[PDB]
Amino acid sequence: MAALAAAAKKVWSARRLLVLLFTPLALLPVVFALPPKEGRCLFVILLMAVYWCTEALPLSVTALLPIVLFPFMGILPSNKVCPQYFLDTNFLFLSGLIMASAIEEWNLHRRIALKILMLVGVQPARLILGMMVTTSFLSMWLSNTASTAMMLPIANAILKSLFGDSRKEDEYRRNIWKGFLISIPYSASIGGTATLTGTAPNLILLGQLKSFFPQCDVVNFGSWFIFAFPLMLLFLLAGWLWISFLYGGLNAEDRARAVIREEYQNLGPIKFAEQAVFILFCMFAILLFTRDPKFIPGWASLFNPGFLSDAVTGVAIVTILFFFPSQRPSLKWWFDFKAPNTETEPLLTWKKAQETVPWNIILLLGGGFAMAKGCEESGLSVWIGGQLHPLENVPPALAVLLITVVIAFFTEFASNTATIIIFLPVLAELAIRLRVHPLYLMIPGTVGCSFAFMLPVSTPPNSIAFASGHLLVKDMVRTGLLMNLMGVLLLSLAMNTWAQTIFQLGTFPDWAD
Amino acid sequence: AAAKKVWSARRLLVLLFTPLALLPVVFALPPKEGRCLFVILLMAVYWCTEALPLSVTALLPIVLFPFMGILPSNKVCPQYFLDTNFLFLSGLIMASAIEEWNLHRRIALKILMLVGVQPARLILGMMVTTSFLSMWLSNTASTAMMLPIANAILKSLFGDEYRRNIWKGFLISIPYSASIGGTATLTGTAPNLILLGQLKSFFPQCDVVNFGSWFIFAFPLMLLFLLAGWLWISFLYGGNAEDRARAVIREEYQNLGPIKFAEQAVFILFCMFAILLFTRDPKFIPGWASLFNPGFLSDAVTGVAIVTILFFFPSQRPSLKWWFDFKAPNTETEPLLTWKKAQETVPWNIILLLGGGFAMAKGCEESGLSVWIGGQLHPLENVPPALAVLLITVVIAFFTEFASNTATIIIFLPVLAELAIRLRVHPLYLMIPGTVGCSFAFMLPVSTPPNSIAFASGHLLVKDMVRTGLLMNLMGVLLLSLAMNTWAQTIFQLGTF
Numbered sequence A: 001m002a003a004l005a006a007a008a009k010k011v012w013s014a015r016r017l018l019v020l021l022f023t024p025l026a027l028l029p030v031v032f033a034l035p036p037k038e039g040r041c042l043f044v045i046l047l048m049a050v051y052w053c054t055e056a057l058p059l060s061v062t063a064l065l066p067i068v069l070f071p072f073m074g075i076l077p078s079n080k081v082c083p084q085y086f087l088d089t090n091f092l093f094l095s096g097l098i099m100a101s102a103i104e105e106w107n108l109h110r111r112i113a114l115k116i117l118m119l120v121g122v123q124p125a126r127l128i129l130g131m132m133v134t135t136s137f138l139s140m141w142l143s144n145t146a147s148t149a150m151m152l153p154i155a156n157a158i159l160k161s162l163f164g165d166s167r168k169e170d171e172y173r174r175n176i177w178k179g180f181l182i183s184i185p186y187s188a189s190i191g192g193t194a195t196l197t198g199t200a201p202n203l204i205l206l207g208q209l210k211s212f213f214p215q216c217d218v219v220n221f222g223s224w225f226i227f228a229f230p231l232m233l234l235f236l237l238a239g240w241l242w243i244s245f246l247y248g249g250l251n252a253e254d255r256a257r258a259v260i261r262e263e264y265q266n267l268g269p270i271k272f273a274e275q276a277v278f279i280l281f282c283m284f285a286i287l288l289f290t291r292d293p294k295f296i297p298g299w300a301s302l303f304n305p306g307f308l309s310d311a312v313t314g315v316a317i318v319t320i321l322f323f324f325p326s327q328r329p330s331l332k333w334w335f336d337f338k339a340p341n342t343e344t345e346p347l348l349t350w351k352k353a354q355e356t357v358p359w360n361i362i363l364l365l366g367g368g369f370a371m372a373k374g375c376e377e378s379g380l381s382v383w384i385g386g387q388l389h390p391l392e393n394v395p396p397a398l399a400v401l402l403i404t405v406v407i408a409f410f411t412e413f414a415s416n417t418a419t420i421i422i423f424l425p426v427l428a429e430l431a432i433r434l435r436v437h438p439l440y441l442m443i444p445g446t447v448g449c450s451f452a453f454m455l456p457v458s459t460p461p462n463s464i465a466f467a468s469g470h471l472l473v474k475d476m477v478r479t480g481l482l483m484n485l486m487g488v489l490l491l492s493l494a495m496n497t498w499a500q501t502i503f504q505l506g507t508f509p510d511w512a513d
Numbered sequence B: 001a002a003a004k005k006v007w008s009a010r011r012l013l014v015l016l017f018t019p020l021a022l023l024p025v026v027f028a029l030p031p032k033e034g035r036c037l038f039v040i041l042l043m044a045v046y047w048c049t050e051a052l053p054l055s056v057t058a059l060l061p062i063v064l065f066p067f068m069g070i071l072p073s074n075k076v077c078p079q080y081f082l083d084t085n086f087l088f089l090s091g092l093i094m095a096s097a098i099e100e101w102n103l104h105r106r107i108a109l110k111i112l113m114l115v116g117v118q119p120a121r122l123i124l125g126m127m128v129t130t131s132f133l134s135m136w137l138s139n140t141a142s143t144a145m146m147l148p149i150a151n152a153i154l155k156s157l158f159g160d161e162y163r164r165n166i167w168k169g170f171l172i173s174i175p176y177s178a179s180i181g182g183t184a185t186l187t188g189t190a191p192n193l194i195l196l197g198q199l200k201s202f203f204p205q206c207d208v209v210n211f212g213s214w215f216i217f218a219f220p221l222m223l224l225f226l227l228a229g230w231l232w233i234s235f236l237y238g239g240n241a242e243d244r245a246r247a248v249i250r251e252e253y254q255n256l257g258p259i260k261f262a263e264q265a266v267f268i269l270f271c272m273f274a275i276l277l278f279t280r281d282p283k284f285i286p287g288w289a290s291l292f293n294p295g296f297l298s299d300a301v302t303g304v305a306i307v308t309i310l311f312f313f314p315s316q317r318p319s320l321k322w323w324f325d326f327k328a329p330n331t332e333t334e335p336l337l338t339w340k341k342a343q344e345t346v347p348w349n350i351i352l353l354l355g356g357g358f359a360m361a362k363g364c365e366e367s368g369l370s371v372w373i374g375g376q377l378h379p380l381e382n383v384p385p386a387l388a389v390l391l392i393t394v395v396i397a398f399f400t401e402f403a404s405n406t407a408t409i410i411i412f413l414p415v416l417a418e419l420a421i422r423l424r425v426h427p428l429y430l431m432i433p434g435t436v437g438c439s440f441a442f443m444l445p446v447s448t449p450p451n452s453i454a455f456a457s458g459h460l461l462v463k464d465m466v467r468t469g470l471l472m473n474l475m476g477v478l479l480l481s482l483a484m485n486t487w488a489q490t491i492f493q494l495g496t497f
C-alpha cells in the first residue's frame, strides 16, 4: 500500500517533464488520421493546449511554440507567424498596461479605493457591497491579481479593527471574515470583463476575430463596454446578494470608520502627479469610448476610414505619460535666477513601465493570435466545420447555453486566456455551421471563460484569496457553483436581449461567408 | 544666465519645438512622402537628443502613420515583431541564461588568462572575433551572440569615468565589427546576395562577380577599415600593478571551482545555437533549411527552438537512481531558466526599438519616399564618374543610417544600374560601392539591428554612438573610394566599357 503511494508521489514530482515528453507521443496519431496540413496544425494546437493546461512550460514559453512548429511542419512560414505576435490588439493591451502602471505608481488606485469605501459605508452588508464595487471598478483598468493583492490588506485591516457569546457571535465573525475575503477575487474577476483592457481573454477575442474574420469591425472599446458593463453590474449585484446571504446573515463601526480614515490620511495631501495621471486616464477612457461607438460618429470618422484603431489612441495617450512633468510648473521659475536647476521628473519613467508590465501575457496573446492564424490558413477550421455536422440542429440559444457551461467548467482548471485561445476557433466554426452570427457564440465563450470561481487554481486572485489562509476549498466551491450558474444565466440573458441591438447579432453578417 | 535655465529644460524645449522646425519638410515635398519624411526626421532627432525614451520614440509610428494616412494601424503594428526581433529576443534570453549560471564569468576569466587585462587588446581581439564570425553569418546573429561575451569580459575585468568609458567603447565595438565583417563576403550580408540576384536579372552576360573575386576585393577593405575603427574606438574610449592583477585574477579563477552541470548545459545549448545558426542556410553549401519548404525557416525558428529548451531542461544532473531511492525527497528541480528571471533580465525596450525601425522602413517603402529619393537623385549624372561614385557612396552611407541595409540596397541598386547605363560607365563601378556603403551603418539604432543589440546594455547613449558614427562613415567612404579606384579596377575588369 505504501509502495503505491510512494510511486504516485514520485511520478507526481516529475509531472512536468513526463507530460512534456509523452504528450507528443500520445498526439502522433492525429497527424496520421487527418490530412497532412490539417493534422499537423491540430497536433500543434493540442500540444499547446495540453502544455497550457498542465503548465509543463511557462504560458509565455508555450505561446512561442508556433514559431518552432509552424515552419517545421510547413503550416506557415516564419516571416508570417512572427508578425502575428504584435497585432494592434497587443499595442492596445500594452497601452492599458502602461496606464495601469502609471495609476499604481502614484497610488491613485489606493486613493480611489479608500474614497469609495469611505463613501459606501461601514455596515457589513454595505461594506461587502462597497468593497466588491471598488474591486470591480478598479479591475476594469488594473489587473485582477494586483487589485486582489491590494484589496486584501485593506479588508484584513478593517476586520482587525472591527473585531479588535458562546458560538453564535464568533461564528458570525468567521463568516464575515470569509465573506470579505472571498468577495474581493470574485468581484475582481467579474469587473475584469467589463472593458477590453480589463482582462486578456477579451483581447484574445479581438485578435482571433481580426484573424478569422478580417472584415469584422463591430467590436471595439465602446461597444464592448456598453455591452458588458450592465452585465458586469448585474452579475456583481447578484454575487453581492449571494455572498451576503450565505455569510453575512442577510462602537465597532466607529472603530472601522476611524481606521479607514487614518489609512486614507496616510496617503498625505493629493499630489500634482495624481491629478495629472487621473486627468490623463479620464481622457484615455473617454477617447477610447468615443472613438467609434457605432451609433454616434466618433472622432475617427473625420479622419481616414480604416486607418485609426484603439491601439493608436492608447499609444498616443500613454506617450504623454513619459514626458509630462510630475511637479507643478511655475512661470516664476524662469524669472528667479537663484532658483535651483534640478532636472524634472516625468509622470512615468520607462524603467517603471518595464518592470511593471506583464510581457508574458503579451506573448501569450500573441501566441493565441498566431495559432488562430495558423488554424485558419492550414485549413483546420474548415475541417472542424465539416466535422461539426451533427451539431447543426441545436437551437442557437441552447447552443450558447451549452458552450457557456462547457467553457465555464473548463476554466475552473486552466487559465482563462489559454481556455479562450483553445476554444475560440471551435466556437467560430460552430457559429458558421449553425448559420448564426459568429459573435453570438464568441462573446459568450469570451465572457464565460472568466467565470472561474470554484478553485484557487482557477484564477490568480483566487490563489491570493486562498493564500490569505482564512478560506477553505469547500467554501469557495459552494459559492462558485451558484456564481457560475448565475453568471451563465445572466450571460444568456445579455446575449439574447441587448447584445442583439449592440452587435447586430440578429442577422447573419455577409462577411461571415 | 538664462542659458542654464534653458538647458535645464532642454528635453521639453526640443520636444515641443522640433515638430514646428520640421513643418517646412511637409510642404517641401509631396504630402504622402512629406509626412513620412517628417516622421522619420522627428524620430531621428528625438533619438539623438533623448527627448523621449528610445522605446517611446520607437512607438511614434503607431501614432503618426495612421493619423496622417501613411499606413493603417493594423499594418504598422505587426511590423514590431518581424522574425528579426524573435532572433534578438532569443539571443537576449540566452544571454540571461548564461549570466544567471555564471558561465559568462568563466568564459571571461578564461579569455583574460589567454590574453591579459591589457587595455584595448581585449577590444581588438573581441572586434576581430566578431568580424570573423560575422563573415559567414548575418550580422544580427553574430552581434547577438557576441554581446554576451562582451558583457562577460566587461563585468569581469572591472569586478570612475574610465570604467564607464571603456564600458561604452568595448560595447560599441561589437555592432561595428559585425557590420565590417559582414561586407567582406557574398554570404556575410543579405545585400551582397541581393546584388548578385539583381545582376543576374539585369546582366546575365556579366559573370566576373563571384565568391572568389568578391573576397579578394573586399577582404583588404574589411581589414583596413576594421583596423581604422579599432584605432578610432580605442583612442576615443580609453586611449607591478599588472602582475598583481594577473595574480588576483588567477586566485579568483581557481575560486570559481569546478564547472557545474548547469554551466556546461548552458554552454552546450549556446554552442548548438551557434552551429545551427551557421549551418541553417549557407549560400555556398546547402544547410538543413533545404530539407523543409523553401523560405519557411529563418534564424527566429532556430533561436526560439533552442531557447525553449532552457525553460524545461533541468539545472541539476539527473540520476536514474533517484527513482529507485524511495527515501530521497521528491522535490522538483528548477529548470535552466525560469520565466520570472527571463522577464526580469530581457530588454523589451529594444525589442520595441527594432520594431520602430522596421516600421520606419515600411512607412518609407509604402509612402513612396524611397522612390522619391531615387528619382530626385537623378541629376547626379552630370559629374565625372569618380565624383559620381563618391557622392553615391556618401549619400547611401547617410541614407542607410535611417533604413535597414537590405531595404536601402533594394531601393538604390536599380537606380545605380540605370545611372550607370545612362552615364555610359561599366555598371559594376556603381553596383559594388553602393552594396558596400549600404552596410556602413554606424550612427543610429535604426540603421542596423546590431546597433540596437549593442544598446541592449542600456549604458550606451545615442550621442557617443553618433560621435563615433560620423568619423566611422567618413573613413568607410574614403576606404571604399580608394579600393574602387585602386585595385577594384583590375579585379572586376571594370576600368573598360
Ligand SMILES: CC(C)CCC[C@@H](C)[C@H]1CC[C@H]2[C@@H]3CC=C4C[C@@H](O)CC[C@]4(C)[C@H]3CC[C@]12C
Residues within 6 Å of the ligand: A019, A022, A023, A026, A027, A029, A030, A033, A046, A050
Ligand atoms: C499526454 C496526455 C495528457 C494526452 C491526453 C489526450 C489524449 C489521450 C488524446 C488527445 C487526442 C486523442 C486522439 C484524437 C483522435 C484519434 C483518432 C482516432 O481514429 C483514434 C484515437 C485518436 C488517435 C485519439 C487518441 C487519444 C488522444 C491522443
Ligand SMILES: CC(C)CCC[C@@H](C)[C@H]1CC[C@H]2[C@@H]3CC=C4C[C@@H](O)CC[C@]4(C)[C@H]3CC[C@]12C
Residues within 6 Å of the ligand: A283, A286, A287, A290, A296, A297, A298, A299, A302
Ligand atoms: C474633449 C475630450 C474628452 C475628447 C472627447 C470629445 C467628444 C465629446 C467629441 C470628439 C469628437 C466629436 C464628434 C466629431 C464629429 C461629429 C460629427 C457631427 O456631425 C456631429 C458631432 C460629432 C458626432 C462629434 C460629437 C462629439 C465628439 C465625439
Ligand SMILES: CC(C)CCC[C@@H](C)[C@H]1CC[C@H]2[C@@H]3CC=C4C[C@@H](O)CC[C@]4(C)[C@H]3CC[C@]12C
Residues within 6 Å of the ligand: A325, A327, A328, A329, A330, A331, A333, A340, A341, A342, A343, A344, B008, B009, B012, B013, B016
Ligand atoms: C510651451 C512652450 C512655449 C514653453 C514650455 C515651458 C516649459 C519647458 C517649462 C515651463 C515651466 C517649467 C517648470 C517650472 C518649474 C520646475 C521646477 C524646477 O525643478 C525645474 C523643472 C520645472 C518642472 C520646470 C520644467 C520646464 C517647464 C515645464
Ligand SMILES: CC(C)CCC[C@@H](C)[C@H]1CC[C@H]2[C@@H]3CC=C4C[C@@H](O)CC[C@]4(C)[C@H]3CC[C@]12C
Residues within 6 Å of the ligand: A397, A489, A490, A492, A493, A494, A496
Ligand atoms: C437570471 C435568469 C433567471 C434570467 C435569464 C434567463 C435566460 C436563460 C432567458 C431570459 C431571456 C430569454 C430569451 C428571451 C427570448 C427569446 C426569443 C425566443 O425566440 C428564443 C429564446 C430566447 C432567446 C430566450 C432564451 C432564454 C433567455 C435568455
Ligand SMILES: CC(C)CCC[C@@H](C)[C@H]1CC[C@H]2[C@@H]3CC=C4C[C@@H](O)CC[C@]4(C)[C@H]3CC[C@]12C
Residues within 6 Å of the ligand: B014, B017, B018, B021, B022, B024, B025, B028, B045
Ligand atoms: C530639432 C533640430 C535639432 C533640427 C535641426 C534641423 C532642421 C531645423 C532642418 C534640417 C534640414 C532642414 C530643411 C532643409 C531644406 C528645406 C527646404 C526649404 O525649401 C524649406 C526648409 C527646409 C524644409 C528645411 C527646414 C529645416 C530643416 C528640417
Ligand SMILES: CC(C)CCC[C@@H](C)[C@H]1CC[C@H]2[C@@H]3CC=C4C[C@@H](O)CC[C@]4(C)[C@H]3CC[C@]12C
Residues within 6 Å of the ligand: B025, B028, B029, B041
Ligand atoms: C545635419 C544635416 C545634414 C541636416 C539633417 C538631415 C536632414 C534633416 C536633411 C539633410 C538634407 C536635407 C534635404 C536637402 C534638400 C532637400 C530638397 C528640397 O526640395 C526639399 C527638402 C530636402 C529634401 C531636405 C530635407 C531635409 C534633409 C534630408
Ligand SMILES: CC(C)CCC[C@@H](C)[C@H]1CC[C@H]2[C@@H]3CC=C4C[C@@H](O)CC[C@]4(C)[C@H]3CC[C@]12C
Residues within 6 Å of the ligand: B272, B275, B276, B279, B286, B287, B288, B289, B290, B291
Ligand atoms: C552537430 C549538430 C549541431 C548537428 C548539426 C550537424 C549539421 C552540420 C548537419 C546535420 C544534417 C546535415 C544536412 C543533411 C543533409 C543535407 C542535404 C544535402 O543535399 C546537402 C547537405 C545537407 C543540408 C546537410 C548539411 C549539414 C547538416 C545540417
Ligand SMILES: CC(C)CCC[C@@H](C)[C@H]1CC[C@H]2[C@@H]3CC=C4C[C@@H](O)CC[C@]4(C)[C@H]3CC[C@]12C
Residues within 6 Å of the ligand: A013, A014, A017, A018, A021, B314, B316, B317, B318, B319, B320, B322, B323, B329, B330, B331, B332, B333
Ligand atoms: C525519457 C523517459 C522515458 C524518462 C524520463 C525521466 C526523467 C523525467 C527523470 C530521470 C532522472 C530524473 C531526475 C533525477 C533526480 C532528481 C532530483 C530530485 O530532487 C527530483 C528531480 C530530479 C532532477 C529528477 C527529475 C526527473 C528526471 C530527469
Ligand SMILES: CC(C)CCC[C@@H](C)[C@H]1CC[C@H]2[C@@H]3CC=C4C[C@@H](O)CC[C@]4(C)[C@H]3CC[C@]12C
Residues within 6 Å of the ligand: B037, B040, B041, B364, B373, B376, B377, B378, B379, B395, B398, B399, B402, B403
Ligand atoms: C531621412 C532618411 C530616410 C534619408 C536620409 C536623408 C535624405 C532624405 C536626403 C539625404 C541627401 C538628400 C539629397 C541631397 C541632394 C539632392 C540633389 C537635388 O536633386 C535635391 C534633392 C536631393 C536628391 C536630396 C534628396 C533628399 C536626400 C536623399
Ligand SMILES: CCCCCCCCCCCCCC
Residues within 6 Å of the ligand: A020, A024, A028, A031, A043
Ligand atoms: C518538446 C516539445 C516539442 C516537441 C516537438 C515534437 C514534434 C513531433 C512531430 C510529429 C509529427 C510530424 C511527423 C513528420
Ligand SMILES: CCCCCCCCCCCCCC
Residues within 6 Å of the ligand: A068, A072, A073, A074, B292, B293, B305
Ligand atoms: C525542435 C523540434 C523540431 C521538430 C521538427 C518536426 C518536423 C516535422 C515535419 C518534418 C517534415 C516537414 C515537411 C513535410
Ligand SMILES: CCCCCCCCCCCCCC
Residues within 6 Å of the ligand: A272, A275, A276, A279, A280
Ligand atoms: C485646480 C485644478 C488644478 C489641476 C492641476 C493638474 C492639471 C493636469 C492637466 C493634465 C493635462 C493632460 C493633457 C494635456
Ligand SMILES: CCCCCCCCCCCCCC
Residues within 6 Å of the ligand: B015, B019, B023, B026, B068
Ligand atoms: C496636416 C499637418 C501635418 C504636419 C504636422 C504634423 C504635426 C504632428 C506632431 C506630432 C508630435 C508628436 C510628439 C509630441
Ligand SMILES: CCCCCCCCCCCCCC
Residues within 6 Å of the ligand: A304, A316, B063, B067, B068, B069
Ligand atoms: C497625438 C498627436 C496627433 C497628431 C495628428 C496629426 C495628423 C496630421 C494629418 C491630418 C490629416 C490627415 C489626412 C490627410
Ligand SMILES: CCCCCCCCCCCCCC
Residues within 6 Å of the ligand: B136, B210, B211, B212, B284
Ligand atoms: C567556414 C570557413 C569557410 C568555408 C568555405 C571556404 C570556401 C568558400 C566557399 C566555397 C565555394 C567557393 C567558390 C564559389
Ligand SMILES: CCCCCCCCCCCCCC
Residues within 6 Å of the ligand: B264, B265, B268, B269, B309, B313
Ligand atoms: C560532453 C561532456 C559530458 C556531459 C554531456 C552532457 C552534458 C549536458 C548536455 C545537455 C544537452 C541539452 C540539449 C540536448
